[PDB]
Amino acid sequence: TNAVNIVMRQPTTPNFSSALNITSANEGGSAMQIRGVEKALGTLKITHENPSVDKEYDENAAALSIDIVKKQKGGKGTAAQGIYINSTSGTAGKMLRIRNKNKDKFYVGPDGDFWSCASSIVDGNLTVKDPTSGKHAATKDYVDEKIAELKKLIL
Amino acid sequence: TNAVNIVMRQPTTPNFSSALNITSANEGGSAMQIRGVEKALGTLKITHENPSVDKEYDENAAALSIDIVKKQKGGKGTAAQGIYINSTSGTAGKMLRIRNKNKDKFYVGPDGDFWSCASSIVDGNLTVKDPTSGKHAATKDYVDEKIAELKKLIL
Amino acid sequence: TNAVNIVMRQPTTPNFSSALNITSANEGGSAMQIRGVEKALGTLKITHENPSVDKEYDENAAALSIDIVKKQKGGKGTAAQGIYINSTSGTAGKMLRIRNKNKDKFYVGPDGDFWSCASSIVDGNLTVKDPTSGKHAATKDYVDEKIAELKKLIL
Amino acid sequence: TNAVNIVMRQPTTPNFSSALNITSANEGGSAMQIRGVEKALGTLKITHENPSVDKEYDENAAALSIDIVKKQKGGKGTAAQGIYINSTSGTAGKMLRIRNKNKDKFYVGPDGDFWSCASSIVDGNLTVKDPTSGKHAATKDYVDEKIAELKKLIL
Amino acid sequence: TNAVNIVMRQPTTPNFSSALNITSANEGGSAMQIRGVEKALGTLKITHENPSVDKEYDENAAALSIDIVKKQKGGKGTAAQGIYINSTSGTAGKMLRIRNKNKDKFYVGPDGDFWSCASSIVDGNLTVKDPTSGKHAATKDYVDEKIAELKKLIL
Amino acid sequence: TNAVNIVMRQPTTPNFSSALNITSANEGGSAMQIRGVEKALGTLKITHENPSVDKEYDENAAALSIDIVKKQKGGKGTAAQGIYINSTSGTAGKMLRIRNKNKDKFYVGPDGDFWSCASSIVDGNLTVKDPTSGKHAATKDYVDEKIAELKKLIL
Numbered sequence: 010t011n012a013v014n015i016v017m018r019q020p021t022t023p024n025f026s027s028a029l030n031i032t033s034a035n036e037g038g039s040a041m042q043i044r045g046v047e048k049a050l051g052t053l054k055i056t057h058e059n060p061s062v063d064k065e066y067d068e069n070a071a072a073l074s075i076d077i078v079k080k081q082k083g084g085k086g087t088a089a090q091g092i093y094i095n096s097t098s099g100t101a102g103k104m105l106r107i108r109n110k111n112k113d114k115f116y117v118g119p120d121g122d123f124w125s126c127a128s129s130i131v132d133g134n135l136t137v138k139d140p141t142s143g144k145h146a147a148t149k150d151y152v153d154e155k156i157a158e159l160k161k162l163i164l
Numbered sequence: 165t166n167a168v169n170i171v172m173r174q175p176t177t178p179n180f181s182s183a184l185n186i187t188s189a190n191e192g193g194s195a196m197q198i199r200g201v202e203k204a205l206g207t208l209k210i211t212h213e214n215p216s217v218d219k220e221y222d223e224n225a226a227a228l229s230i231d232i233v234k235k236q237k238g239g240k241g242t243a244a245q246g247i248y249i250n251s252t253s254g255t256a257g258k259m260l261r262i263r264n265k266n267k268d269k270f271y272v273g274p275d276g277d278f279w280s281c282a283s284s285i286v287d288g289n290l291t292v293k294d295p296t297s298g299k300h301a302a303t304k305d306y307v308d309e310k311i312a313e314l315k316k317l318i319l
Numbered sequence: 320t321n322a323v324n325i326v327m328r329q330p331t332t333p334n335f336s337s338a339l340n341i342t343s344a345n346e347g348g349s350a351m352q353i354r355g356v357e358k359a360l361g362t363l364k365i366t367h368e369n370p371s372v373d374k375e376y377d378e379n380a381a382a383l384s385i386d387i388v389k390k391q392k393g394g395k396g397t398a399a400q401g402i403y404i405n406s407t408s409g410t411a412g413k414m415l416r417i418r419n420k421n422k423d424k425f426y427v428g429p430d431g432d433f434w435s436c437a438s439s440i441v442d443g444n445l446t447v448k449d450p451t452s453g454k455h456a457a458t459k460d461y462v463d464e465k466i467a468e469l470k471k472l473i474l
Numbered sequence: 475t476n477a478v479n480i481v482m483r484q485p486t487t488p489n490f491s492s493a494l495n496i497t498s499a500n501e502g503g504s505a506m507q508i509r510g511v512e513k514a515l516g517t518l519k520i521t522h523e524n525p526s527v528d529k530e531y532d533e534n535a536a537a538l539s540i541d542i543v544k545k546q547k548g549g550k551g552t553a554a555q556g557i558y559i560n561s562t563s564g565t566a567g568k569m570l571r572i573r574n575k576n577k578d579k580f581y582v583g584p585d586g587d588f589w590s591c592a593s594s595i596v597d598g599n600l601t602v603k604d605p606t607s608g609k610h611a612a613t614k615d616y617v618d619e620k621i622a623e624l625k626k627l628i629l
Numbered sequence: 630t631n632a633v634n635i636v637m638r639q640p641t642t643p644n645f646s647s648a649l650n651i652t653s654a655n656e657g658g659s660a661m662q663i664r665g666v667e668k669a670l671g672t673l674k675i676t677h678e679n680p681s682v683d684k685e686y687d688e689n690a691a692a693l694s695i696d697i698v699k700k701q702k703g704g705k706g707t708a709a710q711g712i713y714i715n716s717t718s719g720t721a722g723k724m725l726r727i728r729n730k731n732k733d734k735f736y737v738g739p740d741g742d743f744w745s746c747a748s749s750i751v752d753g754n755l756t757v758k759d760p761t762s763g764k765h766a767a768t769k770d771y772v773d774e775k776i777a778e779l780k781k782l783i784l
Numbered sequence: 785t786n787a788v789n790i791v792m793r794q795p796t797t798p799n800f801s802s803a804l805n806i807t808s809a810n811e812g813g814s815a816m817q818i819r820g821v822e823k824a825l826g827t828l829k830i831t832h833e834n835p836s837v838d839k840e841y842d843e844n845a846a847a848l849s850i851d852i853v854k855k856q857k858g859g860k861g862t863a864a865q866g867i868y869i870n871s872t873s874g875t876a877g878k879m880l881r882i883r884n885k886n887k888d889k890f891y892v893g894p895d896g897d898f899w900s901c902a903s904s905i906v907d908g909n910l911t912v913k914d915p916t917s918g919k920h921a922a923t924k925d926y927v928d929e930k931i932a933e934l935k936k937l938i939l
Binding site: 323325 | 630631632636
Binding site: 660677682684708709744754776 | 786800805808831863871872879886904921
């Protein structure tokens with residue numbers, strides 16, 4: 010079926026080895042590039058399967074893990090980005106869509122709007138526009154204004 | 165140009181086959197690893213191209229698709245993560261940057277702050293800090309306080 | 320150690336070439352697929368290293384770069400998604416976890432709740448539920464109600 | 475089973491393309507190297523299968539085809555060898571063993587002796603040592619001597 | 630060092646699996662092609678190493694094993710060749726050179742002459758030209774002639 | 785065109801590195817296997833090109849180089865073969881065909897007969913059958929017999 014298949018079989022003892030390991034020392038080009046024309050699949054599909062029946066066994070595991078590091082010998086830092094997503098021609102699809110058991114839980118749409126299915130938290134302020142609707146969040150401004158308006162009506 | 169090029173040509177009829185398919189049964193190491201030193205590109209770059217001129221044809225497609233599953237025969241669950249992004253040494257760049265037609269739409273910065281370019285939605289509450297600025301969102305606390313303060317001034 | 324290792328050595332002059340370049344013209348299947356059973360690692364791990372000691376040198380670089388494009392000759396658009404994350408069986412782990420120097424900065428949990436470590440911004444409204452707690456953000460509704468309630472008490 | 479499998483499926487029309495194509499421009503190292511420790515198989519095994527039921531269809535085909543050429547732009551020639559076989563430590567096995575339907579037809583042994591199962595031909599002379607046995611081939615010398623010996627006995 | 634390295638580690642029990650397995654179903658092109666520009670090495674180098682200290686353990690093994698077979702389902706035969714060696718531009722080097730412990734044992738030169746280091750055998754006749762030198766092998770013709778010449782001198 | 789292409793570009797200084805390097809430590813299976821269905825090409829085609837215009841520059845080079853070695857740490861020897869060629873079903877084609885500038889110089893046919901285009905040499909005897917034809921080589925037997933026959937006719 011597949012043009013190239015790379016299989017790492019189960020070793021007797023787990024070890025740190027990979028089926029496929031790629032390294033480039035060329036700062037002028039992507040170490041790896043993929044291009045596909047899928048009608049309804051991912052150009053890259055990554056599946057992580059719990060190696061154990063135990064449902065908490067793989068709690069530190071991930072399908073995709075990214076690290077962003079300084080130059081190994083003597084680097085002063087890095088300003089590289091983690092994930093960069095673009096559509097040079099423009100897309101109508103969701104830029105980031107997160108589902109759990111095939112139900113949408115969080116997404117970022119093509120206009121940069123987000124939708125979250127549950128109560129969330131910002132350890133800081135959220136800057137927003139003034140509400141123009143019932144369930145829009147109220148700014149300090151809107152509160153202060155309805156206050157000052159009611160102070161007046163008591164003279 | 166490239167060290168290794170893998171090409172799957174257009175079949176007469178589309179089928180489920182991949183240019184490159186990797187599977188590891190070793191729970192001790194990443195099935196695949198990539199490392200690059202790009203000055204201005206992605207270490208991995210994934211491009212998805214609509215296979216059709218029709219702009220809605222690829223609405224279920226994605227550049228990157230991730231699935232997180234239990235052990236196939238008899239697993240009780242999984243606690244594996246979807247995408248994990250870190251910078252062990254620390255980065256000044258945006259951890260997640262989403263653009264559409266080369267304009268920023270949503271990002272998560274290195275301090276975990278987010279910026280969204282459009283009206284968004286949480287089906288639940290948002291916990292925030294008290295506003296200290298005009299367009300900061302107001303907490304139940306801030307509202308209740310300006311209320312209690314105005315009750316007093318009417319004795 | 321690794322089953323397959325692909326190395327692109329440092330060229331004398333940087334150029335656009337990749338260690339590994341994959342292209343599929345088959346719209347019926349993922350150009351590439353990866354599956355692993357890691358106990359505590361990423362099924363795919365991508366590391367980007369600053370090629371320079373200079374901490375701002377790689378400011379346009381990324382570990383993962385995604386582009387979503389129309390059909391090259393004559394496409395009218397695309398509705399393809401950037402990143403799609405699912406757990407067909409269901410996971411307890413965070414769907415998106417972003418850390419900087421091994422400290423959590425932003426995440427999206429399995430229920431679609433998000434947590435951000437810093438003040439954030441929406442250029443638009445945020446729709447939320449009515450606050451039921453001190454530091455929950457207040458809706459236009461909650462503000463208007465405590466206003467109308469205080470108007471009444473002044474008759 | 476295999477660590478890496480590369481499959482080129484049957485195209486609708488045959489064309490000149492290969493499953494795997496390797497080119498090196500480095501004159502200092504082998505474009506490819508293979509090493510194995512087989513107990514009873516070839517380190518490399520090549521099978522050619524007639525693509526047709528017709529028994530004469532593949533008469534120009536070969537399992538292994540070697541070409542030895544001059545430098546493409548302006549070379550004056552080459553002195554490169556076709557096949558070089560050595561045993562740096564020394565082997566007791568046949569250096570070249572040729573069988574047809576699992577019966578030996580021709581071989582070259584570890585001392586450089588050959589054995590051929592059928593009448594053969596040299597378009598030229600064969601230089602040999604004087605016969606010391608019935609079915610050894612006779613040199614001009616041996617013939618001339620038995621002649622001169624018989625001339626004498628007729629005085 | 631190498632651009633691509635494929636390693637199959639020692640399994641606990643030997644099995645029939647390969648580091649690299651290639652199959653083409655395209656009758657129009659070589660399943661695999663290699664091209665190099667070595668100054669003093671093989672374009673392909675194959676090393677077989679005895680897996681055992683025992684000097685007779687690998688007596689059925691080979692560095693290169695070739696099989697030439699009919700079409701699997703219903704073929705009537707094949708006329709494919711085993712090894713085909715050419716030099717389209719012409720070479721001064723030996724076409725086949727066989728050494729054991731770095732000493733020449735057998736070769737075929739660029740003119741098709743062979744040299745064998747030991748007594749050899751043809752189960753059949755050898756056709757040769759008439760001897761013109763002492764140690765050239767004698768034809769039936771040369772023998773018969775020196776006979777008829779000596780019959781005459783006895784009248 | 786090709787499913788997998790591996791290219792090692794010209795380095796500034798030649799070094800010992802390969803485009804593709806394969807090693808198996810599994811004594812139970814071929815380190816590599818190739819299978820093709822070519823109508824008129826080699827299942828594997830190896831081309832060596834002189835890296836220099838100088839026609840003697842590559843005099844130690846080869847298209848295919850084979851080494852047969854003992855186990856590295858403490859082996860007592862090896863009985864492995866260099867090249868093993870078979871046709872399990874049987875072939876009508878030449879088992880080994882050697883050409884120089886597209887003219888046949890030496891071959892071994894499917895019955896194990898050889899043909900050489902030039903004067904050749906065996907440092908030893910050649911055992912052959914008695915001549916039954918003019919240009920067949922004469923055995924010690926045939927010579928001795930025509931001698932004894934002529935002794936008789938002189939009584």
